[PDB]
Amino acid sequence: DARRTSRNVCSNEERKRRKYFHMLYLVCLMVHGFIRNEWINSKRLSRKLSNLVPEKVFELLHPQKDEELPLRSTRKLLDGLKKCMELWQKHWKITKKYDNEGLYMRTWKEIEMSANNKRKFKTLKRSDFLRAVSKGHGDPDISVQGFVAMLRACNVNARLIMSCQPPDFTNMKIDTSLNGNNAYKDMVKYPIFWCEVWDKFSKKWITVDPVNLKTIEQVRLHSKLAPKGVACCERNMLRYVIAYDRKYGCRDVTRRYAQWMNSKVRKRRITKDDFGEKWFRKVITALHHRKRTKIDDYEDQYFFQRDESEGIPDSVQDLKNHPYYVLEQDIKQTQIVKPGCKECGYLKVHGKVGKVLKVYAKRDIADLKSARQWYMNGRILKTGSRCKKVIKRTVEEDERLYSFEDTELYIPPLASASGEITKNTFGNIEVFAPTMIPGNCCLVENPVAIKAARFLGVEFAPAVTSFKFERGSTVKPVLSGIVVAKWLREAIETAIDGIEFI
Amino acid sequence: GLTVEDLLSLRQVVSGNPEALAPLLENISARYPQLREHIMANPEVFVSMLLEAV
DNA sequence: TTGACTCAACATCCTTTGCTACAA
DNA sequence: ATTGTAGCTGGATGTTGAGTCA
């Protein structure tokens, strides 16, 4: 209807489909960067590109170590890199426009209709790439890739950098139209691929774009390569800047290029929740084919500091779900400020003169749970524990809340000689945590473990492992299996396996 | 758990024609319902697959 | 050209072991 | 036939985009 498009919010089904498609697409792009990084290492190619760099210039790329003042060496490195940029302009004799948005971000609408029309595709094999780089023919992406290849030929530690642009799974719109005005010029304003070079003298990665922006920079807080402006970020949303090195390393290097990694960028990454964090780590590990170096340590120290100095964000939206900070007003009803702590900063609220909000570090916020809630985590309360907060409930009711320190690990009683378990009022044992299994016992989870145990006539207890919440008006216990004594495990497992004969 | 034909295309697009991802990925995932669940739980497996047969 | 609002329509989290009426 | 079962969770809190305003 009209109210559907007025909303401009897609279904929940679409949300999930976009999230999955985002991942799939990301993985493919990251794998593409891995493979392309191999090609760049090509031996047949490097012997050819080496000859583009005069001896005089080669020396500048490998300056003498300067004791008194290492800066002078950095200076000489940068000068070498500059001359390399210059003669690369000379080498690359024909530049092509991107035929269709290159590797910039596509819209969902574009992706939906891409399946619609079968387009002709000129295949690019590994050899074609090499031939194109040596002859100096191709779009801007192929150009920088060629450039990284030249630097490596000169035995400099040059990374290929890829800014991955999967479609934005945060974009929940139905209609995902773009402004056509100066569409191309804005799209190519910042590059997708560039280069980074290690400086052993100052111990930092130097940023190099010899193709698009034609600069060399030593990034502290600001980078000329991070896209800026609403227009530009419609085809270039910086969230996964990946570095590939000579020795087949793969590092997420976004921290360098995002001024607001923790507040803005984080929100737009698959990494924004615990599952996606682990998921992304899995992709990286899969592309990271080398051992850790001292260089990794230096870059991590750089990243650790960039994290320390981003600080509190300027705006309320950017503090929604931040990994380090919370607004006073966003502290959950079930949380308290740790004794002796206060705000760690303030936020000027845009729109109201002198209006200010108190900002807390999350390390100073404590999570509380009720007695029942702790039991669901296999915990009971200590003797003479006092509750830290009291809160309302449902059909009200005053539930008391306790801190982790007021709690103890629940240890259940052992099974008897005959294998008898002590069970609750319904004749079952509650097992919400490994901890909740008796020491001389084991948990066997199987749709037929009960039928089995009854058939052997042995001593057991049905295991309530969780609760299914359902329609009607009624909660239900999930009896997902069995707790038996340890010495009866294989008997049980044999019967289960032979359930059809019972 | 793909065919010979699709795995060939996928590797070729990923390696030398990533501009052609969108329709290929649109097509493939519509014909392989399981893939969704595979990528989500086992992305590394998928990765090494693509890195193979070269 | 900005971000903090409000609005409204969903989505997601937290709940954590029934009750009544009636056909056979 | 005095048992077997069809039918009757939400309520507080968070996320999303449009729109308006200063």
As a whole number of angstroms, the distance between CA A47 and CA A41 comes to: 11
Domains and CATH numbers, chain A: 1-310 (3.90.260.10), 311-367 (2.20.20.110), 368-409 (3.30.60.290), 410-502 (no CATH)
Nucleotide with C1' nearest the A12 CA: C11
CB A398 within 8 A of CB A447: no
The dihedrals phi and psi of A378, each to the nearest 5 degrees, come to 65, 40
State how far the Cα of A119 lies from the Cα of A139, in Å rounded to an integer.
19
Q: How many helices (H) and strands (E) does chain B have?
A: 4, 0
Cβ–Cβ under 8 Å, residues A459 and A414? no
The sign one gets for the Cα dihedral A360, A361, A362, A367 is negative
Q: Is A393 exposed, middle or buried (0-12, 13-18, 19+ CB in 10 A)?
A: exposed
Strand partners, A199: A204
Taking the C-alpha atoms of residue A173 and residue A175, their distance in angstroms, rounded to an integer, is 6
Q: What sign has the CA pseudo-torsion A236, B17, A42, A47?
A: negative
DSSP A437-485: S-TTEEEEE-TTHHHHHHHHT--EEEEEEEEEE-STT-EEEEEEEEEEE
* Most distant CA atoms of chain B, gap in Å: 27
Asked if residue A319 lies in contact with residue A263, where contact means CB atoms within 8 angstroms, the answer is yes
Pick the closest to residue A197 from A85, A352, A325, A109 (CA basis).
A85
Q: Where are the domains of chain B?
A: 1-54
CA A313-A319-A323 angle, to 5 degrees, is 95
Contact with chain A for residue B8, Cβ under 8 A = no
Q: Which residue carries 């984080």 as its tokens?
A: A266
Residue with tokens 């012997």: A47
Helix axis angle, A489-497 to A449-456, nearest 10°? 110
Mutate to test the interface with B, among A37, A101, A121 (most CBs of B within 10 A): A121
Mutate to test the interface with B, among A27, A101, A270, A278 (most CBs of B within 10 A): A27
Residues 72-131 of A with CB under 8 A from B: 99-100, 102-103, 106, 110-112, 114-115, 118-119, 121, 123-126, 128-129
Residue pair A276/A269 in contact (Cβ under 8 Å)? The answer is yes
- CA gyration radius for chain A? 30
Q: Both tokens of residue A243? A: 């570095």
For residue A473, say whether its CB is under 7 Å from any atom of strand C.
yes
State the burial class of residue A90 (Cβ atoms within 10 Å of its Cβ: 0-12, 13-18, 19+).
exposed
Through-space distance between the first and last CA atoms of chain B, rounded to whole angstroms:
18
Q: Tokens for A183?
A: 């569409």
Residue B35 CA to residue A268 CA, distance in Å, equals: 24
A311: its two tokens: 């600080």
Phi, psi of A186 (to 5 degrees): -70, -35
Question: Any bridge partners for residue A372, and if so which?
Answer: none
Which technique was the structure solved with, according to the deposited record? X-ray
Within chain A, what is the greatest distance between any pair of CA atoms?
A: 89
Tokens of A248: 């087949």
The CA–CA distances, whole Å, from A21 to A104, A168, A367, B15 equal: 16, 10, 35, 19
Give how far Cα A58 sits from Cα of A51, A52, A151, Å: 10, 10, 10
Report the distance separating Cα B4 and Cα A36, nearest Å. 23
Tell me the residue type at A246: R
Residue from A371, A334, A376 nearest A467 by CA: A376
Would you give the DSSP letter of residue A120? -
Nearest beta carbon to residue B50 from set A31, A114, A115: A31
User: Which residues does a chain break follow in chain A (C to N more than 2.5 Å)?
Assistant: 395
Count CB neighbours of A256 within 10 A: 22
CB contact under 8 Å between B47 and A102, yes or no, is: no
Closest residue (CA to C1') to nucleotide D6 in the complex = A472
C-alpha to C-alpha distances, A33 to A58, A83, A194, A249, nearest whole angstrom: 27, 26, 12, 11
C-alpha distances in Å from residue A454, one per residue of A428, A457, A486: 14, 5, 17
Task: For residues A431 and A376, give the distance between their C-alpha atoms in angstroms, rounded to a whole number.
Answer: 9
Q: How far apart are CA A15 and CA A177, in angstroms?
A: 18
Q: Which helix (H) or strand (E) holds A146?
A: helix A140-153
> Are the C-beta atoms of residues A207 and A225 closer than 8 Å to each other?
yes
Distance CA A482, CA A493 (A): 11
Residue type, B12: Q
Say if residues A255 and A198 touch (Cβ distance below 8 Å): no
* Spacing of C-alpha B27 from chain mean position: 10
Sequence length of chain B is 54
In terms of CATH, what superfamily is B1-54? XPC-binding domain (1.10.10.540)
Q: Does B3 touch chain A (CB under 8 A)?
A: no
* Cβ atoms B1, B15 nearer than 8 A: no
A399 with A390: CB under 8 angstroms?
yes
For residue A124, give the 3-state DSSP assignment: coil
CA of A8, C1' of D17: distance in angstroms? 6
Structure tokens at A108: 């969902």
- In chain A, % helix, strand, coil (3-state, to 5) comes to 40, 20, 40
Beta bridge partners of A365: A337
Residue A140: Cβ within 10 Å count: 20
Q: What is the DSSP string of A199-253?
A: ETTTTEEEEEESSSS-EEE--SS--TTS--STTGGGS-----EEEE-TTS-EEE-
Give the E-state strand segments of A2-150 in sequence order: 94-95, 137-138
The amino acid present at A49, given as its one-letter code, is: L
Structure tokens at A470: 């359902």
In A246-305, the residues whose Cβ lies within 8 Å of chain B are 279, 282-283, 285-287
What CA–CA distance (Å, rounded) separates A370 from A291? 46
Length of chain A: 502
Cα(A485)–Cα(A262) distance, rounded to whole angstroms? 49
Asked if B12 contacts B50 with a C-beta cutoff of 8 angstroms, the reply is no
The strand D neighbours among A residues 296-325, by Cβ under 7 Å, are 320-321
Closest-CA residue to A41 (of A163, A103, A133, A124): A133
CA dist., res. A407 & res. A344, Å (int): 29
**Which residues are registered as beta bridge partners of A484?**
A442, A460
Q: Can you tell me the distance from the alpha carbon of A375 to that of B37, in angstroms, rounded to the nearest whole number?
A: 33
Q: How many CB pairs under 8 A join A and B?
A: 86
Query: In 3-state terms, what secondary structure has residue A427?
Result: coil
The end-to-end CA distance of chain A, in Å, is 58
Contact A241, A227 (CB under 8 A): no
